[PDB]
Amino acid sequence: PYLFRHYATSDLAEMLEIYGLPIRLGKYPPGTADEEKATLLRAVTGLGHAAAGIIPETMAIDFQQAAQGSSDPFLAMMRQSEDAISKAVLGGTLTSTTSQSGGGA
Amino acid sequence: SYCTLADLIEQYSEQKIREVSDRVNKPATTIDTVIVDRAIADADSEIDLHLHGRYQLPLASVPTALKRIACGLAYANLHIVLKEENPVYKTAEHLRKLLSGIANGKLSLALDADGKPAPVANTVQISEGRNDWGADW
Amino acid sequence: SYCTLADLIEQYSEQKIREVSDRVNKPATTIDTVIVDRAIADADSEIDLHLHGRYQLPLASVPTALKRIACGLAYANLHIVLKEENPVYKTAEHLRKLLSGIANGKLSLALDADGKPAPVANTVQISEGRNDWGADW
Amino acid sequence: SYCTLADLIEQYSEQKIREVSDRVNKPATTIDTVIVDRAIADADSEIDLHLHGRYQLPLASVPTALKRIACGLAYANLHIVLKEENPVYKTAEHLRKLLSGIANGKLSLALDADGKPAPVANTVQISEGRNDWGADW
Amino acid sequence: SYCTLADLIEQYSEQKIREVSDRVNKPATTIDTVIVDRAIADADSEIDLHLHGRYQLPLASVPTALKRIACGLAYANLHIVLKEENPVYKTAEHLRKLLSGIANGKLSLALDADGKPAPVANTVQISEGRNDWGADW
Amino acid sequence: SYCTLADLIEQYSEQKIREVSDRVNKPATTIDTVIVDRAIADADSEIDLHLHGRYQLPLASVPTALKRIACGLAYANLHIVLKEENPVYKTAEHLRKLLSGIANGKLSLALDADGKPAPVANTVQISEGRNDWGADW
Amino acid sequence: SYCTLADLIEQYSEQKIREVSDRVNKPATTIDTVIVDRAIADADSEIDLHLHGRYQLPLASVPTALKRIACGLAYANLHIVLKEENPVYKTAEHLRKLLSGIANGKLSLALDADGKPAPVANTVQISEGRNDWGADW
């Protein structure tokens, strides 16, 4: 369960790192020079934090929505690991987390 | 000045330039430098029209393909009357097609002698860019 | 210099080069090296125009197909007047089609002698890449 | 060297090669090995241009269809002036169509003598692949 | 060897093969086995090019339609110069169309003598297949 | 053997078969059974190529339309040189169109004498089929 | 047997059938019943090819339009050599167009003498049909 939690948390951290700016790819026509290609790379890299930009009509840039995901799987796996560890150690789970129900309390 | 009188001679022989450049003496005897200079100027002007959107117009160096294109255009311009079927007209149209290809980003401007030309800063432009909270605070 | 005078001779015989390179003596007697050199330079310039976007222009070695293309283009350029129906014009157009195919990523540049050419670093470019939390911490 | 002088002779008779290879003596008397060698080199160069994207260029063995294509291309190249309507030009265009078909993944490269050629490792490439938790832990 | 000299004779008479196979003696007197062998080899090579993607190339048996195609292609190859309008060229193009149809999965390869050919294992490939919990546990 | 020499005679007279089957004696005197047999074999091979995907190739009985097609194809094959405008070529193309229509599931194979041919089991194939809980338990 | 010799005579006169059916005697003197029988058989075979998908092939009765089509096809088949521009060829193509229209469900097969033909049970097929709880329980 420790390894399960570790993997889930690391993957969630990476996914948090990737959200926000969408991955985008720039295209150039034949006969583009190395200086112009480096310029295009710099522009594409800056477009995420740059609100505006201009390119020749012969060039194109597309946006892809890189992540388009949710954290629910990782949270569920971490909760499972937490519950397993609590049961194995203390024999119960209430002592570590607040029980959100009554009646059977 | 992407080409000179010497370039035109070395491309088209001297006798043909003597024929097409002299309008006063029949048979021609001497090359009139003014007409050749104006033809070269017009060729340079058309090339500038085709190249202003991708490079700095006052080029400090001339690519060799630019020299060939300028010489061809000047020779075509030197004709008072030119038919559609004239081979020089076909060569001029071919050179214009190359110029259009260069303009449309389909062909590149090659070396001048050893270094690259000076691409203009069109694509460089982007907003200032706001990325606070990512400066290692 | 993707081709030389020796290459042009070995491709088109010496008598034809003697005819098309001499503009002063009739019948021709000697090959004028200046005209051949300029024709080769113009052919190299056109090939550079077609190849700058995919390879380093100052090539340290010449592929053999490049030699054939340069020789054909130089021979075509050596003609003062060239018709559309002239077979040399058709060969030049064929070579231009090969050059366009190479430029458009449809044909590859072959070996020079034993090693590959030097593809430029166009496609190499990508962002720096942020992948923290995955460095075995 | 996908073909040799012996192959060209055995395909096109020796008298025709003697005619088209000798440019100095009229009537022709001897085959000039240099011209044939260069024609074969140019044919090999074009085939390499067409085949570099799917196979290793320095092939250790020559497929027989490759030999036929090389011989045809060399014979076509041996002509100083070639018309569009010349039958050898049509055969060369047919061979170029086969080469394009091979390049475009529409035709395959057959046996050399008994074993397959060496397809390049283009399609082989894939990421390293992360599949932990499935290693029988 | 999808066809032999005997097959070519039995298809096109012996006099025609004698004419088209002898290049040294006029009038022809004997059939040169080397030229016929090379023509058959080239025909087999083209058929292999067209058939490698669907069957094992080193076929242990020859379908009869394959024999007809090979004979036609060899006869077409035996001509030093062939026009577009030549009927043998039309027959060769027809056979090439059949070969393309076979390659494109539009026509099938028939019996050799009594048994089917050996289709290659292209379509056979699929993943290993994970279906635990369904093994009658 | 979808057709025989007797069928070819009964379709095209005996004099025409005598002309087109004898290549050694001028004027023709006898029908050469070997050439007719090979022509019939090639016709059967082409029909097998066109019919293998829908029926068992080693047919135990011959449909009559198959006999007509085989006779026409054999007669077409018996010609050493055949033009596009030759009427027999047009008839052969018509028969090939019928064969293609049969192959493409647009035309059916009729009776042999009284019973249907043997359609192959292509469409028959389906998975084993899991339908437990529906076996009247 | 959708048509007979009497039908062919009553359609095309007897003199024309005598001309086209006799291949041995010049001028023709007698009608050869074998050739007419085979022509009728081939016509019936083609019609069966066109009609097997919609009706039972061993028809117990012959529609009259079927008789006209069979007679036309037999007359067309009786010609050893037939051109594209021959009017009988045009009539045969017209009849083939009618046959295709009947096959494609665009035209119907009319009465034989007083009763309808026997349409095959193609469209009849449907699953067994499970509709329990609706049997008036």
CSV table of N, CA and C in Angstrom, one decimal, chain A residues 5-59:
chain,number,residue,atom,x,y,z
A,5,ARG,N,0.4,4.1,-2.8
A,5,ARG,CA,0.2,5.6,-2.5
A,5,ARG,C,1.3,6.4,-3.2
A,6,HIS,N,2.5,5.9,-3.1
A,6,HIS,CA,3.7,6.7,-3.7
A,6,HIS,C,3.5,6.9,-5.2
A,7,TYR,N,3.1,5.8,-5.9
A,7,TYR,CA,2.9,5.9,-7.3
A,7,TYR,C,1.7,6.9,-7.7
A,8,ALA,N,0.6,6.7,-6.9
A,8,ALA,CA,-0.5,7.6,-7.2
A,8,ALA,C,-0.2,9.0,-7.0
A,9,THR,N,0.5,9.3,-5.9
A,9,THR,CA,0.8,10.7,-5.6
A,9,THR,C,1.8,11.3,-6.6
A,10,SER,N,2.8,10.5,-7.0
A,10,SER,CA,3.7,11.0,-8.0
A,10,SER,C,3.1,11.3,-9.3
A,11,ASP,N,2.2,10.4,-9.7
A,11,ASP,CA,1.5,10.6,-11.0
A,11,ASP,C,0.6,11.8,-10.9
A,12,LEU,N,-0.1,12.0,-9.7
A,12,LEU,CA,-1.0,13.2,-9.6
A,12,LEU,C,-0.1,14.4,-9.6
A,13,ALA,N,1.1,14.4,-9.0
A,13,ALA,CA,1.9,15.6,-9.1
A,13,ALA,C,2.3,15.9,-10.5
A,14,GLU,N,2.7,14.9,-11.3
A,14,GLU,CA,3.1,15.2,-12.7
A,14,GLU,C,1.9,15.7,-13.4
A,15,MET,N,0.7,15.1,-13.2
A,15,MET,CA,-0.5,15.6,-13.9
A,15,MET,C,-0.8,17.0,-13.5
A,16,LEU,N,-0.6,17.4,-12.3
A,16,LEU,CA,-0.8,18.8,-11.9
A,16,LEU,C,0.2,19.7,-12.6
A,17,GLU,N,1.4,19.2,-12.8
A,17,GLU,CA,2.4,20.0,-13.5
A,17,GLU,C,2.0,20.2,-14.9
A,18,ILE,N,1.3,19.3,-15.5
A,18,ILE,CA,1.0,19.4,-17.0
A,18,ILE,C,-0.2,20.2,-17.3
A,19,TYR,N,-1.2,20.4,-16.3
A,19,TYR,CA,-2.4,21.2,-16.6
A,19,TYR,C,-2.0,22.6,-17.0
A,20,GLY,N,-3.1,23.3,-17.4
A,20,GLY,CA,-2.9,24.7,-17.7
A,20,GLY,C,-2.7,25.0,-19.2
A,21,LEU,N,-1.5,25.5,-19.5
A,21,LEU,CA,-1.2,25.8,-20.9
A,21,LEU,C,-1.4,24.5,-21.8
A,22,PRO,N,-2.1,24.6,-22.9
A,22,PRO,CA,-2.2,23.4,-23.7
A,22,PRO,C,-1.0,23.2,-24.7
A,23,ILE,N,-0.7,21.9,-24.9
A,23,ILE,CA,0.4,21.6,-25.9
A,23,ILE,C,0.0,22.1,-27.3
A,24,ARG,N,0.9,22.8,-27.9
A,24,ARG,CA,0.7,23.3,-29.3
A,24,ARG,C,1.9,23.1,-30.2
A,25,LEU,N,1.6,22.9,-31.5
A,25,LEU,CA,2.6,22.5,-32.4
A,25,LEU,C,2.5,23.5,-33.6
A,26,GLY,N,3.7,24.0,-34.0
A,26,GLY,CA,3.8,24.9,-35.1
A,26,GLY,C,4.4,24.3,-36.3
A,27,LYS,N,3.8,24.7,-37.5
A,27,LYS,CA,4.3,24.1,-38.8
A,27,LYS,C,4.8,25.3,-39.6
A,28,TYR,N,5.8,25.0,-40.5
A,28,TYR,CA,6.4,25.9,-41.4
A,28,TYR,C,6.4,25.4,-42.8
A,29,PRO,N,6.4,26.2,-43.8
A,29,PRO,CA,6.5,25.7,-45.2
A,29,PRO,C,7.9,25.4,-45.6
A,30,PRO,N,8.1,24.8,-46.7
A,30,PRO,CA,9.5,24.5,-47.2
A,30,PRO,C,10.2,25.8,-47.5
A,31,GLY,N,11.5,25.8,-47.3
A,31,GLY,CA,12.3,27.0,-47.5
A,31,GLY,C,12.4,27.9,-46.3
A,32,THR,N,11.9,27.5,-45.2
A,32,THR,CA,12.1,28.2,-43.9
A,32,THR,C,13.5,28.1,-43.5
A,33,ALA,N,14.2,29.1,-43.0
A,33,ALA,CA,15.6,29.1,-42.6
A,33,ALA,C,15.7,28.7,-41.1
A,34,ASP,N,16.9,28.4,-40.7
A,34,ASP,CA,17.1,28.0,-39.3
A,34,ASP,C,16.8,29.1,-38.4
A,35,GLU,N,17.2,30.4,-38.8
A,35,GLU,CA,16.9,31.5,-37.9
A,35,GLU,C,15.4,31.6,-37.7
A,36,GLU,N,14.6,31.5,-38.8
A,36,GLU,CA,13.2,31.6,-38.8
A,36,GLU,C,12.6,30.5,-38.0
A,37,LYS,N,13.1,29.3,-38.1
A,37,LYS,CA,12.6,28.1,-37.3
A,37,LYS,C,12.8,28.3,-35.8
A,38,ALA,N,14.0,28.8,-35.5
A,38,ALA,CA,14.3,29.1,-34.1
A,38,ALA,C,13.3,30.2,-33.6
A,39,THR,N,13.1,31.2,-34.4
A,39,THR,CA,12.1,32.2,-34.0
A,39,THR,C,10.7,31.6,-33.8
A,40,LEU,N,10.3,30.7,-34.7
A,40,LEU,CA,9.0,30.1,-34.6
A,40,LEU,C,8.9,29.3,-33.3
A,41,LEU,N,10.0,28.5,-33.0
A,41,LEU,CA,10.0,27.8,-31.7
A,41,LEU,C,9.9,28.7,-30.5
A,42,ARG,N,10.6,29.8,-30.5
A,42,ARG,CA,10.5,30.7,-29.4
A,42,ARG,C,9.1,31.3,-29.3
A,43,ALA,N,8.5,31.6,-30.4
A,43,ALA,CA,7.1,32.2,-30.4
A,43,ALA,C,6.1,31.1,-29.9
A,44,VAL,N,6.3,29.9,-30.3
A,44,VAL,CA,5.3,28.9,-29.9
A,44,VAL,C,5.5,28.6,-28.4
A,45,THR,N,6.8,28.6,-27.9
A,45,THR,CA,7.0,28.4,-26.5
A,45,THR,C,6.4,29.5,-25.7
A,46,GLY,N,6.5,30.8,-26.2
A,46,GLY,CA,5.9,31.9,-25.5
A,46,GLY,C,4.4,32.1,-25.6
A,47,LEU,N,3.8,31.4,-26.5
A,47,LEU,CA,2.4,31.6,-26.7
A,47,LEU,C,1.5,31.2,-25.5
A,48,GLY,N,2.0,30.3,-24.7
A,48,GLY,CA,1.2,29.9,-23.6
A,48,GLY,C,1.0,31.0,-22.6
A,49,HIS,N,2.1,31.7,-22.2
A,49,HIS,CA,2.0,32.9,-21.4
A,49,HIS,C,1.8,34.2,-22.1
A,50,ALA,N,1.9,34.2,-23.4
A,50,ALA,CA,1.7,35.4,-24.3
A,50,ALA,C,0.3,35.4,-24.9
A,51,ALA,N,-0.4,36.5,-24.6
A,51,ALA,CA,-1.8,36.6,-25.0
A,51,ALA,C,-2.0,36.7,-26.5
A,52,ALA,N,-1.0,37.2,-27.3
A,52,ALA,CA,-1.1,37.4,-28.7
A,52,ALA,C,0.2,37.1,-29.5
A,53,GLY,N,0.0,36.9,-30.8
A,53,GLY,CA,1.2,36.7,-31.6
A,53,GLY,C,0.7,36.8,-33.1
A,54,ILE,N,1.7,37.0,-34.0
A,54,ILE,CA,1.4,37.1,-35.4
A,54,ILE,C,2.4,36.2,-36.1
A,55,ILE,N,1.9,35.5,-37.1
A,55,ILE,CA,2.7,34.6,-38.0
A,55,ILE,C,2.2,34.8,-39.4
A,56,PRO,N,3.1,34.4,-40.4
A,56,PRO,CA,2.7,34.4,-41.8
A,56,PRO,C,1.5,33.5,-42.0
A,57,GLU,N,0.7,33.8,-43.0
A,57,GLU,CA,-0.5,33.0,-43.3
A,57,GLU,C,0.0,31.6,-43.9
A,58,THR,N,1.3,31.5,-44.3
A,58,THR,CA,1.8,30.2,-44.7
A,58,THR,C,2.3,29.3,-43.6
A,59,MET,N,2.2,29.8,-42.4
A,59,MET,CA,2.5,29.0,-41.2
A,59,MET,C,1.2,28.7,-40.4
